[PDB]
Ligand binder design. Sequence first.
Ligand SMILES: *[C@@H]1O[C@H](CO)[C@@H](O[C@@H]2O[C@H](CO)[C@@H](O[C@H]3O[C@H](CO)[C@@H](O)[C@H](O)[C@@H]3O)[C@H](O)[C@H]2NC(C)=O)[C@H](O)[C@H]1NC(C)=O
Ligand code: NAG
Ligand code: CA
Ligand code: CU
Ligand code: CU
Ligand code: CU
Ligand code: CU
Length: 536
Amino acid sequence: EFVAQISPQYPMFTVPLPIPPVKQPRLTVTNPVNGQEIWYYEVEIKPFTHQVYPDLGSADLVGYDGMSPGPTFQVPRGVETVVRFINNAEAPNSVHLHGSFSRAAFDGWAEDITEPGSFKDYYYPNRQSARTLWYHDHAMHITAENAYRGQAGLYMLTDPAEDALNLPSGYGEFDIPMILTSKQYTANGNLVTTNGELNSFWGDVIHVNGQPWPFKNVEPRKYRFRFLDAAVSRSFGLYFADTDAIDTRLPFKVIASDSGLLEHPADTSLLYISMAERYEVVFDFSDYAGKTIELRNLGGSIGGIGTDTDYDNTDKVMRFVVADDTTQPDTSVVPANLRDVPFPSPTTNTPRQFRFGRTGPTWTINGVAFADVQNRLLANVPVGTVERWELINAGNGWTHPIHIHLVDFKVISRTSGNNARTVMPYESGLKDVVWLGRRETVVVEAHYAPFPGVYMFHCHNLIHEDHDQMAAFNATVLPDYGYNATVFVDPMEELWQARPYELGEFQAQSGQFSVQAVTERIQTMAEYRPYAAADE
Ligand SMILES: *[C@@H]1O[C@H](CO)[C@@H](O[C@@H]2O[C@H](CO)[C@@H](O[C@H]3O[C@H](CO)[C@@H](O)[C@H](O)[C@@H]3O)[C@H](O)[C@H]2NC(C)=O)[C@H](O)[C@H]1NC(C)=O
Ligand SMILES: *[C@@H]1O[C@H](CO)[C@@H](O)[C@H](O)[C@H]1NC(C)=O
Ligand SMILES: [Ca+2]
Ligand SMILES: [Cu+2]
Ligand SMILES: [Cu+2]
Ligand SMILES: [Cu+2]
Ligand SMILES: [Cu+2]
Protein backbone atom coordinates (compact mmCIF):
# COMPACT_ATOMS: atom_id res chain seq x y z
CA GLU A 1 0.00 0.00 0.00
CA PHE A 2 0.92 3.67 0.25
CA VAL A 3 0.62 6.75 2.30
CA ALA A 4 -1.63 9.79 1.63
CA GLN A 5 -0.05 12.59 -0.40
CA ILE A 6 1.07 15.56 1.69
CA SER A 7 1.82 18.09 -1.03
CA PRO A 8 -1.17 19.85 -2.62
CA GLN A 9 -3.15 18.02 -5.31
CA TYR A 10 -1.47 18.56 -8.68
CA PRO A 11 -3.08 18.64 -12.17
CA MET A 12 -1.59 15.32 -13.31
CA PHE A 13 -0.20 14.91 -16.84
CA THR A 14 -1.30 18.35 -18.10
CA VAL A 15 2.06 20.07 -18.62
CA PRO A 16 4.41 19.14 -21.49
CA LEU A 17 7.78 17.58 -20.58
CA PRO A 18 10.28 20.44 -20.66
CA ILE A 19 13.72 19.90 -22.24
CA PRO A 20 16.70 21.70 -20.69
CA PRO A 21 18.37 23.96 -23.25
CA VAL A 22 21.81 23.11 -24.58
CA LYS A 23 24.57 25.12 -22.87
CA GLN A 24 26.75 26.95 -25.39
CA PRO A 25 30.41 27.88 -24.82
CA ARG A 26 31.17 31.58 -24.55
CA LEU A 27 34.32 31.21 -26.66
CA THR A 28 37.23 28.90 -27.34
CA VAL A 29 40.84 29.25 -26.24
CA THR A 30 43.84 27.86 -28.09
CA ASN A 31 45.84 25.40 -26.00
CA PRO A 32 49.52 26.38 -26.35
CA VAL A 33 50.58 22.80 -25.65
CA ASN A 34 48.88 21.11 -28.60
CA GLY A 35 47.18 23.80 -30.68
CA GLN A 36 43.75 22.38 -29.86
CA GLU A 37 40.77 24.54 -28.95
CA ILE A 38 39.48 24.43 -25.39
CA TRP A 39 35.81 25.29 -25.01
CA TYR A 40 35.17 27.86 -22.26
CA TYR A 41 31.79 28.24 -20.53
CA GLU A 42 30.40 30.58 -17.88
CA VAL A 43 27.66 29.30 -15.57
CA GLU A 44 25.93 31.67 -13.14
CA ILE A 45 24.59 30.01 -9.99
CA LYS A 46 21.69 32.20 -8.89
CA PRO A 47 18.30 32.19 -7.11
CA PHE A 48 15.10 32.09 -9.12
CA THR A 49 11.46 31.29 -8.52
CA HIS A 50 9.32 28.80 -10.39
CA GLN A 51 5.54 28.54 -10.39
CA VAL A 52 5.14 24.78 -10.07
CA TYR A 53 1.53 24.83 -8.89
CA PRO A 54 -0.60 26.93 -11.30
CA ASP A 55 -3.09 28.09 -8.66
CA LEU A 56 -0.71 28.48 -5.71
CA GLY A 57 2.36 30.56 -4.91
CA SER A 58 5.84 29.93 -6.29
CA ALA A 59 8.84 27.84 -5.25
CA ASP A 60 12.25 29.24 -4.32
CA LEU A 61 15.08 27.61 -6.23
CA VAL A 62 18.79 28.12 -6.88
CA GLY A 63 20.21 26.78 -10.09
CA TYR A 64 22.89 26.82 -12.69
CA ASP A 65 22.10 29.71 -15.05
CA GLY A 66 18.99 30.21 -12.93
CA MET A 67 17.15 27.11 -14.12
CA SER A 68 16.58 23.55 -12.93
CA PRO A 69 17.72 21.25 -14.37
CA GLY A 70 20.81 23.23 -15.31
CA PRO A 71 21.43 23.58 -19.05
CA THR A 72 22.68 20.48 -20.92
CA PHE A 73 26.34 20.37 -21.96
CA GLN A 74 27.17 18.53 -25.20
CA VAL A 75 30.89 17.88 -25.61
CA PRO A 76 32.70 15.64 -28.10
CA ARG A 77 35.46 13.32 -26.85
CA GLY A 78 38.86 14.94 -27.24
CA VAL A 79 37.68 18.51 -26.62
CA GLU A 80 38.84 19.83 -23.25
CA THR A 81 36.48 22.21 -21.45
CA VAL A 82 36.82 24.87 -18.81
CA VAL A 83 33.70 25.86 -16.91
CA ARG A 84 33.72 28.95 -14.74
CA PHE A 85 31.03 28.21 -12.15
CA ILE A 86 30.11 31.61 -10.77
CA ASN A 87 28.41 31.79 -7.38
CA ASN A 88 25.90 34.62 -7.48
CA ALA A 89 23.74 32.91 -4.88
CA GLU A 90 23.38 32.78 -1.11
CA ALA A 91 25.27 29.69 0.10
CA PRO A 92 28.51 27.99 -0.93
CA ASN A 93 28.74 25.43 -3.71
CA SER A 94 31.13 22.80 -4.99
CA VAL A 95 30.58 21.40 -8.45
CA HIS A 96 31.14 17.72 -9.23
CA LEU A 97 31.08 16.45 -12.79
CA HIS A 98 29.74 13.00 -12.04
CA GLY A 99 31.14 10.46 -14.52
CA SER A 100 34.38 12.30 -15.30
CA PHE A 101 37.88 11.27 -14.23
CA SER A 102 38.71 14.88 -13.38
CA ARG A 103 41.73 15.83 -11.32
CA ALA A 104 41.08 15.99 -7.58
CA ALA A 105 40.91 19.83 -7.51
CA PHE A 106 38.45 19.83 -10.40
CA ASP A 107 36.31 17.03 -9.03
CA GLY A 108 34.04 18.74 -6.51
CA TRP A 109 35.74 17.76 -3.25
CA ALA A 110 33.19 18.52 -0.55
CA GLU A 111 35.39 21.03 1.28
CA ASP A 112 36.58 22.64 -1.97
CA ILE A 113 33.86 25.26 -1.86
CA THR A 114 33.13 28.48 -3.70
CA GLU A 115 31.63 31.28 -1.60
CA PRO A 116 28.93 33.68 -2.84
CA GLY A 117 30.81 36.41 -4.65
CA SER A 118 33.48 34.00 -5.97
CA PHE A 119 33.85 31.61 -8.92
CA LYS A 120 35.91 28.52 -9.65
CA ASP A 121 37.31 27.41 -13.01
CA TYR A 122 36.90 23.69 -13.56
CA TYR A 123 39.11 22.05 -16.20
CA TYR A 124 37.60 18.83 -17.62
CA PRO A 125 39.33 16.18 -19.75
CA ASN A 126 36.42 14.72 -21.77
CA ARG A 127 38.51 11.73 -22.87
CA GLN A 128 36.34 8.92 -21.51
CA SER A 129 33.84 6.83 -23.46
CA ALA A 130 30.68 8.57 -24.60
CA ARG A 131 28.31 8.61 -21.64
CA THR A 132 25.62 10.63 -19.90
CA LEU A 133 27.41 12.52 -17.13
CA TRP A 134 25.74 15.00 -14.85
CA TYR A 135 27.07 17.98 -12.90
CA HIS A 136 25.73 18.73 -9.44
CA ASP A 137 26.53 20.31 -6.11
CA HIS A 138 28.78 18.54 -3.62
CA ALA A 139 29.39 21.14 -0.90
CA MET A 140 29.97 19.54 2.47
CA HIS A 141 26.86 18.94 4.58
CA ILE A 142 24.65 21.09 2.32
CA THR A 143 24.66 18.86 -0.77
CA ALA A 144 21.13 17.53 -0.27
CA GLU A 145 19.58 21.01 -0.10
CA ASN A 146 21.77 22.50 -2.84
CA ALA A 147 20.84 19.71 -5.28
CA TYR A 148 17.19 19.63 -4.16
CA ARG A 149 16.83 23.36 -4.74
CA GLY A 150 18.15 22.98 -8.27
CA GLN A 151 21.90 22.54 -8.66
CA ALA A 152 22.11 19.58 -11.04
CA GLY A 153 22.25 19.35 -14.84
CA LEU A 154 23.15 16.95 -17.65
CA TYR A 155 26.48 16.73 -19.45
CA MET A 156 26.59 14.59 -22.58
CA LEU A 157 29.98 13.35 -23.73
CA THR A 158 29.62 12.31 -27.37
CA ASP A 159 31.64 10.10 -29.72
CA PRO A 160 31.30 10.37 -33.50
CA ALA A 161 32.30 6.71 -33.73
CA GLU A 162 28.97 5.84 -32.10
CA ASP A 163 27.06 7.67 -34.85
CA ALA A 164 27.21 4.65 -37.16
CA LEU A 165 25.13 2.71 -34.63
CA ASN A 166 22.19 4.71 -36.00
CA LEU A 167 20.44 4.83 -32.61
CA PRO A 168 17.46 7.18 -32.23
CA SER A 169 18.92 10.67 -32.26
CA GLY A 170 18.47 14.42 -31.92
CA TYR A 171 18.50 16.01 -28.46
CA GLY A 172 14.90 16.88 -27.61
CA GLU A 173 13.74 15.13 -30.77
CA PHE A 174 14.20 11.36 -30.42
CA ASP A 175 17.01 11.54 -27.85
CA ILE A 176 15.20 12.69 -24.70
CA PRO A 177 16.69 13.52 -21.30
CA MET A 178 14.69 12.05 -18.39
CA ILE A 179 15.96 13.58 -15.17
CA LEU A 180 13.95 12.26 -12.22
CA THR A 181 13.43 14.05 -8.93
CA SER A 182 11.11 13.51 -5.96
CA LYS A 183 10.11 16.48 -3.81
CA GLN A 184 7.51 17.81 -1.40
CA TYR A 185 5.61 21.09 -1.55
CA THR A 186 3.91 23.23 1.08
CA ALA A 187 0.27 24.29 1.03
CA ASN A 188 1.07 27.46 -0.95
CA GLY A 189 3.29 25.75 -3.50
CA ASN A 190 6.79 26.37 -2.18
CA LEU A 191 9.27 23.58 -1.53
CA VAL A 192 9.48 21.78 1.77
CA THR A 193 13.14 22.04 2.76
CA THR A 194 15.31 18.96 3.24
CA ASN A 195 16.94 20.66 6.23
CA GLY A 196 16.36 18.72 9.44
CA GLU A 197 15.94 15.41 7.65
CA LEU A 198 18.45 12.83 8.89
CA ASN A 199 16.92 9.57 7.64
CA SER A 200 15.76 10.16 4.04
CA PHE A 201 13.71 12.73 2.15
CA TRP A 202 11.45 10.62 -0.02
CA GLY A 203 9.23 13.27 -1.61
CA ASP A 204 5.66 12.67 -2.74
CA VAL A 205 5.76 14.60 -6.03
CA ILE A 206 7.58 12.97 -8.97
CA HIS A 207 9.27 15.31 -11.45
CA VAL A 208 10.80 14.75 -14.85
CA ASN A 209 13.14 17.53 -15.95
CA GLY A 210 11.92 19.71 -13.08
CA GLN A 211 8.23 19.27 -13.90
CA PRO A 212 5.72 17.32 -11.80
CA TRP A 213 3.97 14.45 -13.63
CA PRO A 214 4.29 15.77 -17.20
CA PHE A 215 3.10 14.39 -20.51
CA LYS A 216 4.77 14.15 -23.89
CA ASN A 217 3.26 13.62 -27.32
CA VAL A 218 5.31 10.99 -29.14
CA GLU A 219 5.18 9.30 -32.53
CA PRO A 220 4.80 5.51 -32.87
CA ARG A 221 8.53 4.81 -33.26
CA LYS A 222 11.77 4.43 -31.28
CA TYR A 223 13.03 6.98 -28.76
CA ARG A 224 16.25 7.14 -26.78
CA PHE A 225 15.55 8.03 -23.15
CA ARG A 226 18.38 9.16 -20.90
CA PHE A 227 17.27 8.33 -17.38
CA LEU A 228 19.02 9.92 -14.42
CA ASP A 229 17.92 9.54 -10.83
CA ALA A 230 18.71 13.00 -9.43
CA ALA A 231 16.41 12.58 -6.46
CA VAL A 232 17.62 13.23 -2.93
CA SER A 233 16.50 9.87 -1.55
CA ARG A 234 14.00 8.19 -3.88
CA SER A 235 14.98 5.06 -5.82
CA PHE A 236 12.79 3.87 -8.69
CA GLY A 237 11.64 0.67 -10.33
CA LEU A 238 10.66 2.03 -13.73
CA TYR A 239 8.24 0.40 -16.13
CA PHE A 240 6.02 1.33 -19.06
CA ALA A 241 2.35 0.39 -19.13
CA ASP A 242 -0.53 1.01 -21.49
CA THR A 243 -3.16 2.91 -19.48
CA ASP A 244 -5.68 0.23 -20.56
CA ALA A 245 -3.54 -2.40 -18.81
CA ILE A 246 -1.75 -0.44 -16.10
CA ASP A 247 -0.20 -3.49 -14.39
CA THR A 248 1.29 -5.05 -17.52
CA ARG A 249 4.94 -4.12 -17.98
CA LEU A 250 6.00 -3.49 -21.59
CA PRO A 251 9.39 -4.60 -22.90
CA PHE A 252 12.18 -2.19 -23.78
CA LYS A 253 15.94 -2.16 -24.22
CA VAL A 254 18.64 -0.72 -22.02
CA ILE A 255 21.57 0.39 -24.17
CA ALA A 256 23.81 2.27 -21.73
CA SER A 257 24.77 2.54 -18.08
CA ASP A 258 26.73 5.15 -16.08
CA SER A 259 29.98 4.81 -18.00
CA GLY A 260 28.61 4.32 -21.49
CA LEU A 261 27.07 1.78 -23.85
CA LEU A 262 26.50 -1.83 -22.83
CA GLU A 263 28.13 -4.46 -25.04
CA HIS A 264 24.67 -5.56 -26.16
CA PRO A 265 21.18 -4.20 -25.51
CA ALA A 266 19.56 -5.65 -22.40
CA ASP A 267 15.94 -6.72 -22.86
CA THR A 268 14.15 -5.30 -19.84
CA SER A 269 10.60 -4.73 -18.54
CA LEU A 270 11.59 -3.33 -15.16
CA LEU A 271 14.45 -0.92 -14.59
CA TYR A 272 15.81 -0.49 -11.07
CA ILE A 273 17.49 2.90 -10.82
CA SER A 274 18.81 4.55 -7.67
CA MET A 275 20.28 7.96 -6.88
CA ALA A 276 22.95 9.16 -9.37
CA GLU A 277 22.57 6.15 -11.67
CA ARG A 278 22.20 6.78 -15.42
CA TYR A 279 20.56 4.31 -17.79
CA GLU A 280 19.79 4.94 -21.43
CA VAL A 281 16.72 3.15 -22.72
CA VAL A 282 15.33 2.68 -26.20
CA PHE A 283 11.55 2.42 -26.15
CA ASP A 284 9.61 1.48 -29.28
CA PHE A 285 6.17 3.11 -29.38
CA SER A 286 5.38 1.66 -32.81
CA ASP A 287 3.34 -1.18 -31.29
CA TYR A 288 1.29 1.33 -29.28
CA ALA A 289 -0.03 3.76 -31.90
CA GLY A 290 -3.02 5.71 -30.64
CA LYS A 291 -2.45 4.54 -27.08
CA THR A 292 -1.30 6.32 -23.97
CA ILE A 293 1.77 4.81 -22.34
CA GLU A 294 2.39 5.63 -18.70
CA LEU A 295 5.85 5.57 -17.21
CA ARG A 296 5.31 4.18 -13.73
CA ASN A 297 7.22 3.36 -10.56
CA LEU A 298 6.99 -0.05 -8.87
CA GLY A 299 5.37 0.10 -5.44
CA GLY A 300 6.12 -1.69 -2.19
CA SER A 301 9.37 0.28 -1.88
CA ILE A 302 10.67 -0.57 -5.37
CA GLY A 303 9.30 -4.10 -5.17
CA GLY A 304 11.03 -4.87 -1.89
CA ILE A 305 14.49 -3.77 -3.05
CA GLY A 306 14.22 -0.47 -1.22
CA THR A 307 12.61 0.97 1.90
CA ASP A 308 11.25 4.18 0.32
CA THR A 309 7.90 5.48 1.48
CA ASP A 310 5.28 5.23 -1.29
CA TYR A 311 2.53 7.85 -1.64
CA ASP A 312 -0.75 8.12 -3.59
CA ASN A 313 0.96 9.26 -6.76
CA THR A 314 4.60 8.25 -6.54
CA ASP A 315 3.71 5.16 -8.61
CA LYS A 316 3.30 7.64 -11.48
CA VAL A 317 6.11 9.29 -13.42
CA MET A 318 4.75 10.68 -16.70
CA ARG A 319 2.54 9.94 -19.72
CA PHE A 320 3.36 9.40 -23.38
CA VAL A 321 0.47 10.09 -25.75
CA VAL A 322 1.26 8.09 -28.89
CA ALA A 323 0.09 9.38 -32.28
CA ASP A 324 -1.67 7.11 -34.80
CA ASP A 325 1.12 7.39 -37.40
CA THR A 326 4.65 8.74 -37.86
CA THR A 327 5.40 11.99 -39.68
CA GLN A 328 8.62 10.61 -41.17
CA PRO A 329 9.72 6.97 -41.38
CA ASP A 330 11.81 5.67 -38.47
CA THR A 331 15.20 4.76 -39.92
CA SER A 332 16.92 4.27 -36.54
CA VAL A 333 17.95 0.85 -35.23
CA VAL A 334 19.20 -0.77 -32.05
CA PRO A 335 22.24 -2.86 -33.03
CA ALA A 336 22.79 -6.22 -31.31
CA ASN A 337 26.42 -5.18 -30.92
CA LEU A 338 26.92 -1.76 -29.35
CA ARG A 339 30.58 -1.57 -28.31
CA ASP A 340 33.50 -3.43 -26.78
CA VAL A 341 33.38 -2.43 -23.10
CA PRO A 342 36.83 -1.61 -21.67
CA PHE A 343 36.61 -3.78 -18.56
CA PRO A 344 39.63 -3.63 -16.27
CA SER A 345 42.03 -6.58 -16.09
CA PRO A 346 40.42 -8.91 -13.50
CA THR A 347 42.07 -9.57 -10.13
CA THR A 348 41.90 -12.46 -7.64
CA ASN A 349 43.00 -10.31 -4.69
CA THR A 350 40.63 -10.31 -1.70
CA PRO A 351 38.23 -7.35 -1.92
CA ARG A 352 38.54 -4.35 0.40
CA GLN A 353 35.49 -4.30 2.65
CA PHE A 354 33.27 -1.27 3.21
CA ARG A 355 30.24 -1.50 5.45
CA PHE A 356 27.48 1.06 4.96
CA GLY A 357 25.29 1.48 7.98
CA ARG A 358 24.50 3.74 10.89
CA THR A 359 26.34 4.64 14.05
CA GLY A 360 23.59 6.10 16.14
CA PRO A 361 21.74 8.60 13.94
CA THR A 362 24.79 9.20 11.75
CA TRP A 363 25.15 7.30 8.47
CA THR A 364 28.69 5.91 8.35
CA ILE A 365 31.26 3.91 6.37
CA ASN A 366 33.02 1.35 8.54
CA GLY A 367 31.86 3.38 11.53
CA VAL A 368 33.43 6.59 10.20
CA ALA A 369 31.84 9.93 9.28
CA PHE A 370 33.23 12.36 6.69
CA ALA A 371 33.55 15.11 9.35
CA ASP A 372 36.23 12.97 11.00
CA VAL A 373 39.28 14.34 9.18
CA GLN A 374 41.65 12.04 11.09
CA ASN A 375 39.92 8.83 10.03
CA ARG A 376 38.01 9.46 6.80
CA LEU A 377 40.84 8.46 4.45
CA LEU A 378 39.99 4.76 4.36
CA ALA A 379 42.17 3.45 1.51
CA ASN A 380 45.48 4.07 -0.22
CA VAL A 381 45.65 2.59 -3.73
CA PRO A 382 48.64 2.91 -6.03
CA VAL A 383 47.64 4.45 -9.35
CA GLY A 384 47.06 1.73 -11.92
CA THR A 385 45.99 -0.93 -9.42
CA VAL A 386 42.87 -2.95 -10.17
CA GLU A 387 41.01 -3.57 -6.91
CA ARG A 388 37.75 -5.24 -5.99
CA TRP A 389 35.80 -3.55 -3.20
CA GLU A 390 33.13 -5.42 -1.29
CA LEU A 391 30.30 -3.02 -0.55
CA ILE A 392 28.10 -4.28 2.24
CA ASN A 393 24.61 -3.28 3.34
CA ALA A 394 23.78 -5.63 6.22
CA GLY A 395 20.60 -3.72 7.03
CA ASN A 396 17.03 -4.49 6.05
CA GLY A 397 15.91 -1.00 7.09
CA TRP A 398 17.76 1.13 4.58
CA THR A 399 19.52 1.05 1.20
CA HIS A 400 22.57 2.77 -0.25
CA PRO A 401 23.57 3.58 -3.80
CA ILE A 402 27.35 3.73 -3.55
CA HIS A 403 29.40 6.01 -5.77
CA ILE A 404 33.17 5.89 -6.20
CA HIS A 405 34.79 8.94 -7.76
CA LEU A 406 37.53 8.77 -10.46
CA VAL A 407 36.79 5.21 -11.58
CA ASP A 408 34.49 3.20 -13.81
CA PHE A 409 33.81 -0.20 -12.30
CA LYS A 410 32.44 -3.58 -13.25
CA VAL A 411 29.72 -5.14 -11.06
CA ILE A 412 31.07 -8.59 -10.19
CA SER A 413 28.48 -9.98 -7.80
CA ARG A 414 25.40 -9.10 -5.77
CA THR A 415 23.96 -11.18 -2.97
CA SER A 416 20.65 -10.49 -1.25
CA GLY A 417 19.65 -11.62 2.24
CA ASN A 418 16.08 -11.59 0.92
CA ASN A 419 17.13 -13.62 -2.16
CA ALA A 420 15.55 -10.86 -4.23
CA ARG A 421 18.05 -10.34 -7.04
CA THR A 422 21.64 -10.67 -8.19
CA VAL A 423 23.50 -8.68 -10.91
CA MET A 424 20.96 -7.17 -13.31
CA PRO A 425 21.33 -7.54 -17.09
CA TYR A 426 21.75 -3.76 -17.44
CA GLU A 427 24.61 -3.90 -14.91
CA SER A 428 26.62 -5.93 -17.48
CA GLY A 429 28.87 -3.03 -18.51
CA LEU A 430 30.73 -0.28 -16.66
CA LYS A 431 29.17 1.80 -13.90
CA ASP A 432 30.14 4.34 -11.23
CA VAL A 433 27.19 3.94 -8.86
CA VAL A 434 25.77 0.63 -7.60
CA TRP A 435 22.64 0.16 -5.52
CA LEU A 436 22.94 -1.80 -2.29
CA GLY A 437 19.31 -2.75 -1.77
CA ARG A 438 17.94 -4.36 1.40
CA ARG A 439 20.49 -6.79 2.84
CA GLU A 440 22.62 -6.61 -0.32
CA THR A 441 26.37 -7.00 -0.71
CA VAL A 442 28.01 -6.04 -4.00
CA VAL A 443 31.54 -6.57 -5.21
CA VAL A 444 32.82 -4.13 -7.82
CA GLU A 445 36.06 -4.22 -9.77
CA ALA A 446 37.87 -1.06 -10.85
CA HIS A 447 41.13 0.26 -12.29
CA TYR A 448 42.21 3.08 -9.96
CA ALA A 449 43.62 5.13 -12.77
CA PRO A 450 44.96 7.15 -14.49
CA PHE A 451 45.40 10.13 -12.16
CA PRO A 452 46.82 10.35 -8.64
CA GLY A 453 44.91 12.27 -6.01
CA VAL A 454 42.56 12.28 -3.06
CA TYR A 455 39.00 11.40 -4.10
CA MET A 456 35.63 10.79 -2.44
CA PHE A 457 33.43 7.71 -2.22
CA HIS A 458 30.02 7.68 -0.57
CA CYS A 459 26.40 6.77 -0.51
CA HIS A 460 24.52 8.98 -2.98
CA ASN A 461 21.36 9.18 -0.94
CA LEU A 462 22.00 12.85 -0.30
CA ILE A 463 20.59 12.79 3.24
CA HIS A 464 22.87 9.87 4.14
CA GLU A 465 25.69 11.66 2.37
CA ASP A 466 25.31 14.89 4.32
CA HIS A 467 25.01 13.03 7.62
CA ASP A 468 27.67 11.80 7.14
CA GLN A 469 28.22 8.79 4.88
CA MET A 470 31.28 9.78 2.90
CA ALA A 471 34.94 8.81 2.92
CA ALA A 472 38.08 9.27 0.89
CA PHE A 473 40.69 7.23 -0.91
CA ASN A 474 44.10 8.34 -2.10
CA ALA A 475 45.24 7.11 -5.51
CA THR A 476 48.96 7.26 -4.87
CA VAL A 477 52.17 7.64 -6.87
CA LEU A 478 55.90 7.51 -6.12
CA PRO A 479 58.04 10.66 -5.79
CA ASP A 480 59.45 10.17 -9.32
CA TYR A 481 56.09 9.75 -11.07
CA GLY A 482 56.09 13.23 -12.63
CA TYR A 483 53.08 14.67 -14.49
CA ASN A 484 53.07 17.66 -12.12
CA ALA A 485 51.47 15.32 -9.60
CA THR A 486 52.61 17.52 -6.69
CA VAL A 487 50.11 20.25 -7.64
CA PHE A 488 47.31 17.86 -8.67
CA VAL A 489 46.90 15.39 -5.79
CA ASP A 490 45.45 17.75 -3.13
CA PRO A 491 41.92 18.85 -3.94
CA MET A 492 42.37 22.00 -1.83
CA GLU A 493 45.52 23.03 -3.76
CA GLU A 494 45.64 26.85 -3.67
CA LEU A 495 46.47 27.18 -7.37
CA TRP A 496 43.03 25.86 -8.21
CA GLN A 497 40.93 27.49 -5.50
CA ALA A 498 37.91 29.70 -6.10
CA ARG A 499 38.52 33.40 -6.80
CA PRO A 500 36.51 36.51 -5.83
CA TYR A 501 34.82 38.36 -8.69
CA GLU A 502 33.06 41.68 -9.07
CA LEU A 503 29.54 41.34 -10.47
CA GLY A 504 30.09 44.34 -12.74
CA GLU A 505 33.12 42.83 -14.48
CA PHE A 506 31.10 39.68 -15.16
CA GLN A 507 28.19 41.65 -16.57
CA ALA A 508 30.50 43.90 -18.59
CA GLN A 509 32.66 40.95 -19.68
CA SER A 510 35.78 42.89 -18.78
CA GLY A 511 38.63 42.57 -16.30
CA GLN A 512 38.71 39.00 -15.04
CA PHE A 513 36.08 38.26 -17.68
CA SER A 514 37.75 39.92 -20.68
CA VAL A 515 38.63 37.66 -23.58
CA GLN A 516 42.31 38.31 -22.90
CA ALA A 517 42.10 37.49 -19.19
CA VAL A 518 40.09 34.29 -19.70
CA THR A 519 42.45 33.28 -22.52
CA GLU A 520 45.58 33.81 -20.45
CA ARG A 521 44.10 32.12 -17.39
CA ILE A 522 43.17 29.01 -19.40
CA GLN A 523 46.43 28.84 -21.36
CA THR A 524 48.34 29.04 -18.09
CA MET A 525 46.16 26.24 -16.62
CA ALA A 526 46.73 24.16 -19.76
CA GLU A 527 50.52 24.46 -19.39
CA TYR A 528 50.39 22.32 -16.21
CA ARG A 529 49.08 19.52 -18.47
CA PRO A 530 46.63 18.06 -15.94
CA TYR A 531 45.33 15.22 -18.16
CA ALA A 532 48.50 14.19 -19.98
CA ALA A 533 48.73 10.82 -18.18
CA ALA A 534 45.57 9.72 -20.02
CA ASP A 535 47.25 10.27 -23.38
CA GLU A 536 49.95 7.61 -23.06
C1 LIG B 1 48.09 11.11 -1.10
O1 LIG B 1 49.20 10.45 -1.69
C2 LIG B 1 50.17 11.36 -2.19
C3 LIG B 1 51.16 10.54 -2.99
O2 LIG B 1 50.63 10.20 -4.27
C4 LIG B 1 50.80 12.10 -1.02
O3 LIG B 1 51.66 13.11 -1.54
C5 LIG B 1 53.03 12.88 -1.12
O4 LIG B 1 53.24 13.29 0.22
C6 LIG B 1 54.58 13.03 0.66
C7 LIG B 1 54.63 13.39 2.13
O5 LIG B 1 54.03 14.65 2.36
C8 LIG B 1 55.58 13.83 -0.18
O6 LIG B 1 56.88 13.38 0.18
C9 LIG B 1 57.84 14.42 0.44
O7 LIG B 1 57.24 15.66 0.81
C10 LIG B 1 58.13 16.76 1.21
C11 LIG B 1 58.29 17.70 0.03
O8 LIG B 1 59.52 17.40 -0.62
C12 LIG B 1 59.47 16.21 1.74
O9 LIG B 1 60.06 17.18 2.59
C13 LIG B 1 59.21 14.93 2.52
O10 LIG B 1 60.37 14.54 3.25
C14 LIG B 1 58.74 13.84 1.57
O11 LIG B 1 59.93 13.26 1.02
C15 LIG B 1 55.36 13.59 -1.67
O12 LIG B 1 56.13 14.53 -2.42
C16 LIG B 1 53.89 13.74 -2.04
N1 LIG B 1 53.67 13.35 -3.43
C17 LIG B 1 52.93 14.06 -4.28
C18 LIG B 1 52.82 13.50 -5.67
O13 LIG B 1 52.40 15.11 -3.96
C19 LIG B 1 49.74 12.79 -0.18
O14 LIG B 1 50.30 13.23 1.05
C20 LIG B 1 48.55 11.88 0.14
N2 LIG B 1 47.45 12.68 0.66
C21 LIG B 1 46.90 12.49 1.87
C22 LIG B 1 47.47 11.39 2.68
O15 LIG B 1 45.97 13.19 2.27
C1 NAG C 1 54.15 21.33 -15.04
O1 NAG C 1 53.60 22.65 -14.99
C2 NAG C 1 54.53 23.67 -15.37
C3 NAG C 1 53.88 25.00 -15.07
O2 NAG C 1 52.73 25.22 -15.88
C4 NAG C 1 54.88 23.48 -16.84
O3 NAG C 1 55.84 24.46 -17.22
C5 NAG C 1 55.47 22.10 -17.04
O4 NAG C 1 55.68 21.87 -18.43
C6 NAG C 1 54.56 21.00 -16.48
N1 NAG C 1 55.24 19.72 -16.53
C7 NAG C 1 54.60 18.56 -16.78
C8 NAG C 1 55.46 17.33 -16.79
O5 NAG C 1 53.40 18.52 -16.98
CA1 CA D 1 40.51 31.43 -0.59
CU1 CU E 1 26.96 12.44 -8.20
CU1 CU F 1 30.96 11.32 -8.78
CU1 CU G 1 22.93 5.48 2.22
CU1 CU H 1 30.45 12.35 -4.93
